[PDB]
Design a binder for these strands. Structure first.
Length: 109
DNA sequence: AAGGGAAAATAAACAATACATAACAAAACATATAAAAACCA
């Protein structure tokens, strides 16, 4: 069932030394819309804010998933996994009182 | 339906007051006898 270890460690060195997947401005602006919701909802219920470093982090996580997918560019649904990775790290790094944010992020989950 | 958040509860240190009784005072209740005072005689 899983990928063997030797092929995986050879794939790491093969993908990290040959490709450089960029991003195209066709429909990527939608993540700036969802960040605009996700920043604002962290002020009213949460105490810790979300900044531009999280946007740089999800673009890096999406291009890392595109690097692992070995594509020419980042797809539209790589950002969905990137925003899931940032929601279950930032929301999980807080109190139990940000519990409404567990369902507030359920619309984009 | 969730949740904020103020009311309510708990605890602990400290201060302030009440309480049980000790010690006593004083008034009611009680008797005694020598001196006055009526009082028969």
């Amino acid at each position: 069932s899983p990928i063997p270890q030797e092929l995986l460690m050879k794939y790491i060195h093969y993908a990290r030394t040959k490709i450089y997947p960029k991003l195209h401005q066709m429909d990527m602006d939608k993540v700036s819309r969802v960040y605009a919701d996700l920043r604002r909802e962290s002020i009213s219920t949460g105490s810790f804010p979300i900044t531009v470093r999280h946007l740089e982090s999800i673009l890096r996580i999406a291009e890392s998933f595109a690097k692992m997918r070995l594509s020419e560019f980042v797809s539209s649904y790589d950002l969905d996994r990137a925003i899931k990775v940032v929601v279950d790290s930032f929301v999980d790094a807080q109190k139990v009182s940000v519990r409404r944010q567990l369902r507030r992020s359920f619309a984009i989950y």
